[PDB]
Amino acid sequence: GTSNRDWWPNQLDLSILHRHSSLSDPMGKDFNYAQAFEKLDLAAVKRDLHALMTTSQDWWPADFGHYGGLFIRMAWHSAGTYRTADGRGGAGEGQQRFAPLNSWPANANLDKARRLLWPIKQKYGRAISWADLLILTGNVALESMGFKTFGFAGGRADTWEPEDVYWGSEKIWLELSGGPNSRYSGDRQLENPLAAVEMGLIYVNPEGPDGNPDPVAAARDIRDTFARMAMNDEETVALIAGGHTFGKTHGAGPASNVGAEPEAAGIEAQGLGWKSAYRTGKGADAITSGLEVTWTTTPTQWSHNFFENLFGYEWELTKSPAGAHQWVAKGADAVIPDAFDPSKKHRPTMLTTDLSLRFDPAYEKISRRFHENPEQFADAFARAWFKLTHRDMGPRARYLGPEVPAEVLLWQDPIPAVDHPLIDAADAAELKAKVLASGLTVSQLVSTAWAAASTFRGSDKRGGANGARIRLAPQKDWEANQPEQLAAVLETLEAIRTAFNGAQRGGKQVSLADLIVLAGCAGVEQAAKNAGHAVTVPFAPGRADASQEQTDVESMAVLEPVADGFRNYLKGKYRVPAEVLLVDKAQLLTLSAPEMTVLLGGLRVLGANVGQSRHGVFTAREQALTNDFFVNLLDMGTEWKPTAADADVFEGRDRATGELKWTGTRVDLVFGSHSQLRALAEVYGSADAQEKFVRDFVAVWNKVMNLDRFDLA
Amino acid sequence: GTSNRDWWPNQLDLSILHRHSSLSDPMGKDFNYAQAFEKLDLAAVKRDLHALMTTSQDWWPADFGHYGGLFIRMAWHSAGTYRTADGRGGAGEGQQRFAPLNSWPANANLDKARRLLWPIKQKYGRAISWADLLILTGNVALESMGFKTFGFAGGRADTWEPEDVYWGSEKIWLELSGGPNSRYSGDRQLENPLAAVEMGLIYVNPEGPDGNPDPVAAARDIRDTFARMAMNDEETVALIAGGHTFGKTHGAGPASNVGAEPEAAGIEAQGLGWKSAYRTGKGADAITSGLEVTWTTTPTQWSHNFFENLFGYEWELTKSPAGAHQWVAKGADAVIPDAFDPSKKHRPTMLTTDLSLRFDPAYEKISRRFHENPEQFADAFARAWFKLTHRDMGPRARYLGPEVPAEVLLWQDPIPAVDHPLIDAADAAELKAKVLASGLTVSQLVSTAWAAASTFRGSDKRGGANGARIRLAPQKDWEANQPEQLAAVLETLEAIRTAFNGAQRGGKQVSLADLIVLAGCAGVEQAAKNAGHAVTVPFAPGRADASQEQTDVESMAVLEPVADGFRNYLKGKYRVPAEVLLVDKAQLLTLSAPEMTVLLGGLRVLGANVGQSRHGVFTAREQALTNDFFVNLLDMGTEWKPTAADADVFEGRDRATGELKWTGTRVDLVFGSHSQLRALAEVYGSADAQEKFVRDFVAVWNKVMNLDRFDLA
Ligand code: HEM
Ligand code: HEM
Ligand SMILES: [Cl-]
Ligand SMILES: [Cl-]
Ligand code: NA
Ligand code: NA
């Protein structure tokens, strides 16, 4: 069946904005996962998971009698798709159970791990999501084998379909670099937003870069991909050595024995894949990666044996039974237990990527420090494991249950507690009138509040106006935020704040975070009034101001908008058309196509454009909230042509007289071009639509202002 | 960006069931189009459309100063995508404005027509849908040129994204037959459900079959395609000769002058396409089809000239200025007006497909009859135009406004008016108890009501339980309906009905249509009771019984389920896997994936399978409403293998003992295989879900029972 994607493969795809609809969701529209989880007996789930660890099923027998290792790997791969560049991937939506992740080669036989968990899922039902369960399983595995974890937060709601994520352009699993869809260029530069070295891998190739078993060059790949997952060198060493303290790899026989991945398997396989024709196809005969390494003398118990082995022996390159490169400690004694035969023992072995921890000079310092001080290793690993598995959960206000760690971590972009009365509706009205009487314009007020709130992304729930981080480094200096204009607006707002807070009794005060948002609401209300309409924009106080010391400047860099179509802004020239970047932004803001459409048309006429550009400002009443953008965009009396100087800027001229009327970008004109967006623009451009436009505008404005307000959830 | 479709192009696509979500819809969730249109001043719209007909815009000048022809064509192509096989296509959703139909070659320069209508759309806003406006414009064109139409109904609500339709497998526009994706096989057999001869055409190729200008062979294609759009010979001749009484074709120069279709054009084209480099690119220089034919001496006025010309001349094959095959009248004088130059005239001309109306023996008789009796022609055309443009609107209860024809037409599958008091809740309780006391089983009651209601399809809003057509030819004899079992159920119900109606005072009575549905409800209630749950099933009376004479047996044939996964039924072997057919049926019933999931698991355990097959009946308590199907499907204790005799039937055996537990089909096992369906199965299979399953089941049951209840809308 030939589709629209076949005929017009480069048209813009809006269906990414309409995923996660009430139609695909089996739970009722009032189902609240946090309320369900808050009543789960978490201890009882953990007791059942502890019992599972040593309850082997014959269809996938447990190595050494213990599934710990398998489940740790599972929870690390659930979390390890995360990319800091866009916040997509991670464990927070349980996406490992859907395509494509359920069938990535690096996820082989994690289908078995997830099936082992079905009896417990089934028992507790909707009170524990698959997403939470994957991570809790990992934690209980660690605890069962003697490792004390840093804690655990529930609250990851299940999703019901695949997320739309750019995982790369390769058309072949595990394609080595420099092919026709190479994700690498230049001096081994990985393209943003990707965070893995090959299609279907989590971070790196365990044999070495494109299969070359050089521990030193592998270290470079490790460092680059982990950094793109927001982990530094200390976290990286702790996580890899930590994880490889447990379990084993599987490569008992040749890879050509392994059949189709789950999404390609037959129906009889009932959601499992990678069925193997090698001997029994499982247990002692298992094939997963093709490597056959067991790192420690006690693979079912926490120890410091990984670093004892890594530094205590000299290593020799060898091949697994499937032919993959690995390392062995020649002239070690056979001290490693076999997974199934009590009478066999083996020599210590390592992956190329394990030896990286010893032969990269920066890693070696850390690994030596951990080797000599295993208590420091255990602490670092616990913290890094918590970060790994929580990094995409959002603000601490979303963390549920009795095991949440009380320590506030810098990476969490923490927001201080509010300990005072909040402003009420009368106070808000008074502050709004002061803001408007100060001389701040509609444009300044809407631009500033937009800049503060629009850093939110739903992928990892980072960003938003809570914290007033717009006043701090680095946000205050981002080009899109117009630093000089910004600094003058914030100086005026801070004087209003100081005056108002000074006049209060009884502890009442307003945060700068709240006032930024409230000032934005006042600007929207004034715009409406300028157009002849009396509207109240809703406002919910309770934001707090974070300090510079509570703000990791380097981690904030990934939230800088380099493209924001809502402000007609592009920081440089990109391979991706600006309209595709607009839709990507809308997706991160959690907007539907109608909401993206209303919001952009309004912003245009309110003066939100960076640099006060006239592009797309299709009105003669700038700073009045009207549907002028749409009515003028859709006027067939104007003809549009790209400019000589820039093919991405367009002149609109009267079709009869030739007179210049307007200029716009691709972001503006896509609303007149794309057949689905034009259909939405037509609604808002109709003669009966003024009231609808204003109402839908205020609602989507308010939605943006509240994107990070999990304290009110 | 590589997608799931790229990696696993044969996995099942569920996103067709979650289309038309509240996310993509710009109107509020309580927007009711029928109420909006009922307040439109239809007369005022029609005045504006009359004015438009002769208001020529320079960007697309009006042929002969009148856009009527162009608008008639536009309305006929809006309607002319309809296929009776599935009810998909047609004018009823205004899909012409979306991909792919907005860019089909046969729709060239209809983008211009629709843009001419933007000022009117804009003026009336949400009170008139594009879907309705396309047809109304057609009607007004006809009236403006002197033809009296049969009437007009509003009520086609706009849609906001492309409908999912199989339009064929060809990868090239206009591909001639016998290619690698040929829609033809055998002795020119067009594949169901298609109703056009080539990809991008409405019905047939105007030059003749695969471009061969044989009017006799073209007639064969015309008759086959029109029949697949529900039109017989008389309607076909009337529509083609009716339509070609007006306007002209456009082929002034070579087709290589014409540029990209709308979905391919640049952004500056603002939603238009087919820009032409030939001379002025428009008006006298227009190029649309490539053909250059003007049929009548007064192309802007109703006349009897089409048939006078077709029979009054002998025809000679010639070529247009673009090189297309067409015909010219031998020895005729130049009597046809030019569209733009008052000093030029032209000889009569015709398409190959026009000459079909004379050289096919059956068409010739009709065309002669119309030539000799122009009043019969005019009436047949009016009737056929109303059918064409209303065929996919559904029951007369959906028809809005003051121009609706009072005459009831057989093709409308009419339902008689109810003229007596309806049963109330006390009566329904009494009838349910009689039904249960008669000895009818849960399985008989659920199967019957399912058979009656599940003929509904949302594509053209045909079918459903209203009418009691299950008791009439041909439904009573369809294999999926189990004719012998069905006859005995209906005999029992009709005795209960006769007894009840005989006891009533005043004119209260119950229809057999209502009682079938009510008996179904009683069976679901009894099933719930069998499982230990106290459940009332909602029931809305008001269905009436249609007669045999109100039921066109040939037109009902397209509603026969040859595949119904909900009854584990397949009539024969098809190219399409049975699970794809299941999803297609769910789409026609308007079901979401969760609703399809719940409904099939329930039906299985209630005994709805055709022929009492055990396939998928994963319970030991058949006829009890439980979640057993899901709990047993997902039990990893069971292993599934395809059988020796049939690879589409599977055996489930205890994984340890080898003992046979169950059998199922691909439709059963797909819920355990496909990662999104299994995710939904897991919700209903969990230990906390029995009450949720029963509740969700009753809701989806009731939805299906009410699908055709536009009298309650
Ligand atoms: C550079 C980073 C890493 C590489 C290249 C990598 C590579 C691999 C490979 C190839 C396997 C074998 C899969 C098989 O054949 O069964 C595996 C196993 C495992 N990895 Fe990693 N790993 C990485 C980091 C991590 C981290 C961060 C963790 C957790 C903190 C983790 C925990 C595990 C565990 C527990 C197993 C054992 C599985 C079992 O016993 O079934 N690894 N690793
Ligand atoms: C076998 C069926 C038919 C064939 C093959 C066909 C073919 C065509 C073609 C090729 C054109 C020229 C497009 C262009 O170059 O502008 C056209 C024009 C037109 N057709 Fe048809 N036609 C069919 C049936 C119909 C029917 C059923 C109607 C309406 C009841 C209709 C009404 C029109 C009208 C009004 C035009 C004139 C457009 C104008 O003035 O711009 N035709 N037809
Ligand atoms: Cl994601
Ligand atoms: Cl359709
Ligand atoms: Na994410
Ligand atoms: Na339809």
From Swiss-Prot, chains A, B:
The record marks R73 as: Transition state stabilizer. Pfam families: peroxidase. GO terms for cellular component: cytosol. Its EC number is 1.11.1.21. It is an enzyme of class 1 (oxidoreductase). Binds 1 heme b (iron(II)-protoporphyrin IX) group per dimer. Keywords: Heme, Hydrogen peroxide, Iron, Metal-binding, Oxidoreductase, Peroxidase. One of its GO terms (molecular function) is heme binding. Heme b binds at H244. It catalyses: H2O2 + AH2 = A + 2 H2O; 2 H2O2 = O2 + 2 H2O. There is a cross-link at W76-Y203 (Tryptophyl-tyrosyl-methioninium (Trp-Tyr) (with M-244)). The keyword Oxidoreductase applies. One of its GO terms (biological process) is hydrogen peroxide catabolic process. Homodimer or homotetramer. Belongs to the peroxidase family. Peroxidase/catalase subfamily. This is Catalase-peroxidase. It comes from Burkholderia pseudomallei (strain 1710b). The lineage of its organism: Bacteria, Pseudomonadati, Pseudomonadota, Betaproteobacteria, Burkholderiales.
